[PDB]
């Protein structure tokens, strides 16, 4: 007699778990953590309020969190990402899931509500919308929270905003910038997928072409290397002298966007800033110049300055518009300045383990370890995330000998690197 | 008319000054740091006791410190490294330099001590490269040691010595780890792990690595550089690790993580870059196939238990410089490079650009700790501030004619950042 | 007033001409070849029968031929590829074009035949892309076929068809293999094997290859490109080969050469790029581990015996476009892409620069064979002359603003070479 | 009672063969060819006159050639390269070896003599000095020769000179440009070793530096890729439009040497030409610019124009001179314009097998297969060279199935590629 949930369940729980069964086969790292951490119950009594994508992979995390003794009350962090069939499966398992595909902005806040009120220990968030809603609607529930586990870039920025500015009164965990997760998201975004959206939408070869990549951070470094590999001539713009010196040494020219704006075939933004590519820059670009945002939002390129009456827009294909100037000049604008963009199950597994361990760490943390500030996942916990993914490669880790562990000032299991280690 | 110096240099100043003049054209980033902060004398009142190599490059650092108001008393960190000519030009310039080429072990500790004690001289700062001068001030003059405003250390073992006193509470003075400061760290990594990583190995071997099987022990800065270099030449690289993060990094970089024994009998090359002792033991050396190459790109000479190969049944043949063939009674030989030591310690010298990065880091690390308020640094080892790291990088940008973009008021408002202030958070790995 | 054309285009010429005008800015190398050889009309008297895609790029080639004095009669090599608008502008320009989008198999052979026979028209040259027009002239009009001055073929199967007649003595006319001409070959290799090699695979899969085990069957142009691309992402790549040179190349590039069976049960991805039949047989598909990906980057759809997977005990589920999950009775599924066909044939189009290289090669291959003296080419298939290959490359250099160095009389005397003549020997692989 | 030889043998034959025994262990590809081709005796009666380096590796080829039924009369192609101890070992084995270290230019031609006259079938050469000596001293012995097997660049050029110009009246084998050998020499020279001499002698890092590589052939492509990998900014000069287009597409600028001569930190020649870097170029180079020849001879850079009285030479280290101009400007000249430069035993094994099979092919060739021209080693013979080196990697070659070999128009063992194949 299941009541505590809100999904559009049509006996979908039988099919829903069958798609989770496939996901469980693909994320054997969490099932190992489930098996290894079982019995001990490190989340015994934990009342977790979650807000993330309701997918078959996520179910493996929620069903793992609940298997380690936690009370799961959940919501969807997006109004279209909910895999209703898996959501309906979670409802039958006992998980208080309030989520469906095609929910409105009112249904969205309604689900976050039914998730909070009906003594919530912890909050697992992806976005920070649930965290901010508990910050302006239930502040006495908020001050009693043991820890906020955040995986989103903006959500974590919102937490760093509260901190130091005198507002954060609860210890937080930045899992986005945590070592094992950051490094793995870097490999997927900046190494593997970096030019997939750009190659998919353009049908030109980058060999022998001139490109300008704005920003030489994670995305910029990844982008330039991939473009360099293809035989493209790449130029870089930077505000950070460390990143600029890094570009110089990597055989790239560090320029001001205007020095190359008139000759480059392709313009790429990956800064996280606004008005990097302005009206003046789009006016100086040579005809057919590809304009691409590989950073955030749609403010990196001032696309709003191209809606004026003299310019005309012609839709070439999906996610490709031609913005034509009265002199006949056209720029190939990809996805209206938005990031072109399903995350691989192995990437989610890395994130899910980091999130799971971040909850176990903050929940069982002593009163004096974590102050009212944002923190990264402990080094030994970061090592545990990596270790749980090693059997997927049949990787044989070496154990330190008693004299070896005595030589280097460290424990046979303990943190192997200093705090400032960059990997 | 001054006699406050000890050099062999019998009017070698004129010639030596020309070498500093030549060096100053290559240390253009230090001359800028000199020019930009002079007249404001940020080291006015600093009494610095130094122990580093005396070269025409180092001399530019010593003189930038003297130009920023500091009063220097210098020593050599090595008994062979001293370029006497520059030591003269410095002594003639007024710097209290106490060094020459061809020192004995007793002369080495005489000079170090000459820096520490003098009538009316009390040291503010210690700039070391090795830690030997620091261990000397710590044990010979503990009362002077407690009164030092800050230690700036270059060396790996010297910094680890400083980190050891911390967590043991023997460190009563703040320390600056320049070795792991971003700009300096990233630059050494590029020199050591990217550009030079196979130089020593290629120089001493005369085989091609393409098509070969190599086992690299450790996947840290050196291991990563090494494996990339070997991957690019066509070598099949196997990795051993104790750290599951570094091992997962290797799995994701296309390498298999194995226990040393799983491949020891099939690899053509064995490389150690751990910083550990007995990574390759007698057991491993015995199981290696004939013509296997054994190399240490890590620390000291204890990564491979070379002393276990000094048994009467084994026969040593130096076939080339730094190359020994250790032949077993059954005829099997292992090609052992530099007797288990790092090869680069007996091959070449550090590029002036790498020296420029380091010297700039050192000068700013001394300017920081000296002018630092209390409570900003306690009795611990710290890394160079981000705005200082950025400045080290910025001073080296004109040599590439780099054009840095400056944030607009609207742009710098969007990010919670200063137009010229720190651009990255503390946990930024770059 | 002419009616010598068959197009659907009801005054579509004005619009279509604008597309050729747009294309001519991207085919700048052909406009130069046009401009440089015009007035000298090297194709004056050539009666060319063509069968290629009708696009605004191809139209620039057809018009360069008509501008060099040639008289053209064109057909489409595909029943879907025709851009009708350009077909109008060409018909209006005077070219005898016989093509439109949405042809039936019977319409396709009607147009091909319309090109071949006409009152007072006898073909000098055949420009094909597929070989279907060549097989048609060879069997329907053998008397016209023996009188053709030269065949210039673009396609892989068309060229192999031409190479088959040779050594069998059925080829009575000289043929130009543009597919394996240096400039064209090196350019396709860069597009197909370097730039696009994993595009189809990345588009249809949603997994990361870094850390995965991949077996690539064949280490030719495609296999080499593929393995490099996979090596760079962090994948562990295994190679299978029949050719010991290509296998030794893989051994030297850091890959293990294995028999397909040695790794079939452990690989995450299987790739075929051989050009052979039954490289991956039912036995292999049965031994693949659950979630294995099967991809064909070779020819047709016979490299993987997909027809052996159409048994009643196997269940097919199209999870995405061009992605089928073939599930066994025990639950094990294999992710099979494009039903064993090449993915690129249903994803994108060929870059205009690649088209420019090819079109330039084709025009010069027709200028060569038409103006070629007898005894220079016999009843065999030949590659484009070196000085012509150099010219194809030279015509594309200004788009990069390349500055070619010219040999001095002393320099060109030192090497047995002409200042502008052939620069490399015949066996030069580049 | 050994007489037919000329070495400085002091019972060195006992130690000599012990160094060959080590070499035999390292080139098991030739011992396999020795074993496989034994019994058949494809060189039965062959009277080979050889001129190459007398090393422990070479001994394995000579002792293999003689093991396949050939009569070995040998000389040294260089006056300093002879490993006397191995030469003395060959003398005892029955090989007519006339060679020693430190022989004069008169001793050199004397040894080539005692090698020819005492009915020589074949000639195996490395240089073409022995081939030219049989061309101007014994022309009736020369016209009776079945084939010339040449491995040297200049020696092969000398043969291509005779051919077409109406002088070559004997079929030749170009083993230098033969597929398996060319590709393997390319890997050693242009991939593995390309920057070893330059890195060894300079002590600067190439990251962030500007380089000019003159020529984009085998050496140029190899050099630029290695420099590109290190983060250097590389520019290229070319005379060949195919090679120039190749550079463009590889993300390099194709320039005239003068456009970059004043800004580049490093100048590299790999053209095979003379006066690429002239007096005018060395006068425009910025102070400390490294000048390096990676091509041929010492004529690529006009070093002879820097001996004039206004310039001064200062020897920095071994193979590094500073050429100082009166204005104080200095250029770092490496090895007086000469190539900086022991070849690995696996490379020699590839060459030795190609040479061995080139001799078996031309000796047993029918009268009508090879005319009076220079040829490359047959494709199936090239495949045999590669196959014999595969067990060193434990490489498992796939055998074509009867229907597979029927599908592609080829034999289960025959040439797998067309003649124009570039690999
Ligand atoms: N493309 C993707 O797959 C993807 C994925 C996740 C996030 N992002 C977003 O992309 C942006 C960049 O991500 P990152 O991880 O590379 O960040 P990062 O902080 O590592 O790098 C951003 C870089 O841009 C530089 N920069 C900032 N303003 C600039 C300016 N206006 N002109 C030139 N350079 C400037 C910064 O100094 C920094 O080096 C962020 O907003 C990030 O959230 C992109
Ligand atoms: N080769 C060079 O040019 C060079 C230069 C400077 C310093 N070093 C020295 O080399 C050592 C390594 O340098 P690094 O920069 O790589 O340091 P690092 O800490 O970044 O890397 C050391 C790695 O070795 C691994 N490791 C430790 N014990 C192991 C074991 N026994 N088996 C397998 N792996 C093991 C660790 O997990 C770590 O990742 C240090 O002592 C350093 O001082 C070498
Ligand atoms: N992927 C693409 O974009 C693309 C593009 C054009 C053509 N192709 C086609 O793909 C096929 C291969 O192209 P290529 O350019 O690599 O040709 P290629 O001849 O250069 O390479 C084929 C390789 O496959 C090897 N091989 C043959 N049978 C084998 C076997 N059964 N097992 C293992 N290896 C085997 C051969 O030794 C040869 O090296 C051709 O039919 C070609 O038309 C693919
Ligand atoms: N560095 C080494 O390890 C090494 C080894 C063997 C031989 N070589 C010699 O080096 C030279 C180059 O060898 P390769 O195999 O690269 O030859 P290659 O024929 O493959 O390339 C030479 C290139 O230089 C270009 N070129 C010729 N003259 C030029 C000019 N004056 N200006 C600019 N470019 C010019 C040619 O077009 C050609 O592309 C040859 O003499 C060769 O014998 C060098």
Q: How far, in Å, CA of D142 to CA of D309, rounded? A: 49
D156, D178 Cβ separation under 8 angstroms: no
Choose from A208, A251, A260, A265 for mutation: most chain D CBs within 10 A.
A251
- Rounded Cα–Cα distance for residues A78 and A83 (Å): 11
Q: Where are the domains of chain A?
A: 1-187+343-395, 188-342
Q: Report the 3 state secondary structure along A35-60.
A: HHHCCCCCCCCCEEEEEECCCHHHHH
**C349 token code pair:** 């189009």
Name the H helices within B131-281.
132-140, 142-145, 156-165, 182-188, 199-205, 221-233, 244-252
Residues with CB under 6 A from ligand 4: C 405, 411, 423; D 153, 189, 214-220, 237-240, 243, 270-273, 276, 294-296, 339
Cα–Cα distance, B366 to B364 (Å, whole number): 5
Q: Distance (Å, rounded) from C-alpha B181 to C-alpha D180? A: 49
- Distance from B226 to chain D by nearest Cα, in Å? 13
> Which residue in B336, B296, B362 sits closest to B62, CA to CA?
B362
DSSP state, residue D378:
P
User: What is the structure's resolution, reported in angstroms to one decimal?
Assistant: 2.6
Q: Please tell me which of the candidates B256, B277, B391 has its beta carbon nearest to residue A404.
A: B277
- H/E stretch holding D48: strand D47-52
Give the distance from CA A181 to its chain's centroid.
Answer: 9
Q: What is the token pair recorded at D169? A: 């009246």
Burial class (CB in 10 A: 0-12, 13-18, 19+), D154: middle
**Could you give the C-alpha distances from B392 to A374, B353, B396, in angstroms and in order?**
29, 12, 7
Using CA coordinates, name the residue in chain D closest to C224.
Answer: D423
Q: In which order are the strands placed within the sheet that holds A47-52?
A: A96-98, A71-76, A47-52, A122-125, A147-150, A172-174, A374-376
User: Is A188-342 the same fold as A1-187+343-395?
Assistant: yes
Counting from 1 in the atom list of ligand 2, the atom nearest the Cα of B297 is: 1
Ligand 3, residue C192: give the atom nearest the CA. Answer: 3
- Ligand 3 pocket, mutate which of C198, C218, C261 (most atoms under 8 A from CB): C218
How many CA atoms, within 13 angstroms, populate the side-chain half-sphere of residue D180? Answer: 32
What does DSSP say about strands C315-320 and C323-327: parallel, antiparallel, or unpaired? antiparallel
**In chain B, count of helices (H) and strands (E)?**
16, 15
Q: Which of C191, C203, C208 has the CB atom closest to A192's CB atom?
A: C208
- The secondary structure of residue A249, as a DSSP letter, is H
The verdict on a CB contact (< 8 Å) between B247 and A420 is no
Q: Can you name the CATH fold of B1-190+350-402?
A: Rossmann fold (3.40.50)
Q: Tell me whether C235 touches chain B (CB under 8 Å).
A: yes
Of ligand 1's listed atoms, the one at least distance from the Cα of A243 is 39
Cβ–Cβ contact D45 with B under 8 A: no
| Tokens representing residue A380 in the block | 């030994």
Q: Provide the shortest C-alpha distance from residue D207 to chain A (in Å).
A: 5
Give Rg (Cα) of chain D. 24
Determine, for residues A228 and D251 on separate chains, whether the beta-carbon distance falls below 8 Å: yes
CA dist A231 and D247 (Å) reads 9
B218 in contact with ligand 2, CB cutoff 6 A: yes
Cβ separation A231–D208 shorter than 8 A? no
Domain A188-342 listed as CATH 3.40.50.720? yes
- The angle at the Cα of C284, spanning C280 to C288, to the nearest 5 degrees, equals 120
Token pair belonging to D39: 């019994």
CA–CA separation, A370 and B60 (whole Å): 46
Strands D312-317 and D320-324: antiparallel
Q: C40 — contact with chain A (CB < 8 Å)?
A: no
* CA–CA distance, A28 with A30 (Å, rounded to integer): 6
The answer to whether the beta carbons of residues A125 and A134 sit under 8 Å apart is no
Comparing C-alpha atoms, which of D73, D67, D69 is closest to residue D48? D73
- Can you say how many angstroms the Cα of residue C233 is from the centroid of all Cα atoms in its chain? 27
Best mutation site among A215, A259, A302 for ligand 1, i.e. most ligand atoms within 8 A of its Cβ? A215
Cβ(A392)–Cβ(A346) below 8 Å? yes
Q: How many CB atoms lie within 10 A of CB C385?
A: 17
Question: Are B249 and A183 an interchain contact pair (Cβ–Cβ within 8 Å)?
Answer: yes
Structure determined via: X-ray
Q: Which residues of C touch D241 (CB under 8 A)?
A: 390-391, 393-394, 397, 404
Instruction: Give D90-131 as a 3 state SS string.
Output: HHHHCCEEECCCCCCHHHHHHHHHHHHCCCCCEEEECCCHHH
Among D185, D199, D262, most B C-beta atoms within 10 A, so best to mutate, is: D199
Among the atoms of ligand 2, which is closest to the Cα of residue B192? 3
Which helix (H) or strand (E) is A142 found in, with range?
helix A139-143
In CATH, which of 3.40.50.1480, 3.20.20.70, 2.60.40.10, 1.10.3720.10 is domain A1-187+343-395?
3.40.50.1480
Cβ-contact C362, C179 below 8 angstroms? no
Residue A127 CA to residue A150 CA, distance in Å, equals: 8
Handedness of CA B208, B211, B216, B220 (dihedral sign): positive
Contacts of B400 in chain D (CB under 8 A): 208
Q: Which of D32, D395, D413, D416 to mutate to test the interface with C (most CBs of C within 10 A)?
A: D395
Contact between chains at B236 and C253 (C-beta distance less than 8 A): no
Closest ligand to C-alpha of residue C200 is 3
In sequence order, the 6+-apart residues with CB closer than 8 A to the CB of D216 are D224, D236, D238, D240, D243, D244, D246, D247, D252
The count of residues in chain A is 423
Q: Tell me how far apart the alpha carbons of residues B67 and D180 are, in angstroms, rounded to a whole number.
A: 63
- Chain C partners within 8 Å of D243 (Cβ): 430
C271 sits in which H/E element: strand C269-272
Which residues 369-388 of chain A have a CB within 8 Å of chain B? 376, 382-384, 386-387
D215 annotated ligand binder = yes
Residue A354 tokens, joined: 């980091």
Whether D212 contacts D269, CB under 8 Å: no
- Establish if B400 touches chain A: CB-CB under 8 angstroms: yes
Q: Are D177 and C240 in contact (CB < 8 Å)?
A: no
Q: Looking at the domain that runs over C191-349, which CATH code has it been given? A: 3.40.50.720
């Amino acid at each position: 007699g299941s009541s505590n949930f809100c999904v559009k369940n049509i006996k979908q729980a039988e099919f829903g778990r069958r798609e989770i069964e496939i996901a469980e086969q693909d994320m054997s790292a969490l099932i190992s953590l489930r098996k290894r951490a079982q019995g001990e119950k490190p989340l015994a009594g934990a009342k977790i309020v979650g807000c993330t994508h309701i997918t078959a992979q996520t179910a493996v995390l929620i069903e793992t969190l609940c298997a380690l003794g936690a009370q799961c009350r959940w919501s969807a962090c997006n109004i279209y990402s909910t895999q209703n069939e898996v959501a309906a499966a979670l409802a039958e398992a006992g998980v208080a899931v309030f989520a469906w595909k095609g929910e409105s902005e009112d249904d969205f806040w309604w689900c976050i509500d039914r998730c909070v009120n009906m003594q919530a220990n912890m909050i697992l968030d992806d976005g920070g919308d649930l965290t901010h809603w508990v910050y302006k609607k239930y502040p006495n529930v908020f001050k009693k929270i043991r820890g906020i586990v955040e995986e989103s870039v903006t959500g974590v920025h919102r937490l760093y905003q509260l901190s130091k500015a005198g507002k954060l009164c609860v210890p937080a965990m930045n899992v986005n910038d945590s070592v094992t997760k950051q490094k793995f998201d870097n490999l997927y975004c900046c190494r593997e997928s970096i030019l997939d959206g750009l190659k998919r939408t353009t049908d030109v070869m980058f060999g022998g072409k001139q490109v300008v990549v704005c920003g030489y951070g994670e995305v910029g470094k990844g982008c330039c290397a991939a473009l360099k590999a293809l035989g493209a001539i790449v130029y870089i713009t930077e505000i950070d002298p460390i990143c600029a010196l890094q570009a110089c040494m990597d055989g790239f020219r560090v320029v001001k966007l205007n020095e190359v704006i008139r000759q480059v075939d392709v313009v790429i933004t990956c800064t996280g800033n606004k008005n990097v590519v302005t009206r003046e820059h789009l006016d100086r670009m040579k005809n057919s110049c590809i304009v691409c945002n590989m950073g955030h939002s749609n403010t990196e390129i001032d696309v709003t300055s191209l809606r004026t009456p003299e310019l005309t827009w012609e839709r070439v294909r999906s996610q490709v518009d031609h913005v034509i100037w009265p002199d006949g000049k056209r720029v190939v604008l990809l996805a209206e300045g938005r990031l072109l963009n399903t995350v691989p199950t192995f990437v989610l597994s890395i994130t899910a383990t980091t999130q799971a361990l971040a909850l176990i760490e903050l929940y069982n943390a002593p009163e004096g370890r974590y102050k009212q500030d944002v923190y990264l996942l402990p080094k030994k916990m970061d090592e545990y995330v990596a270790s749980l993914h090693l059997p997927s490669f049949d990787a044989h880790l070496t154990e330190l000998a008693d004299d070896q562990a005595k030589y280097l000032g460290l424990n046979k299991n303990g943190p192997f690197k200093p705090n400032y280690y960059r990997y």
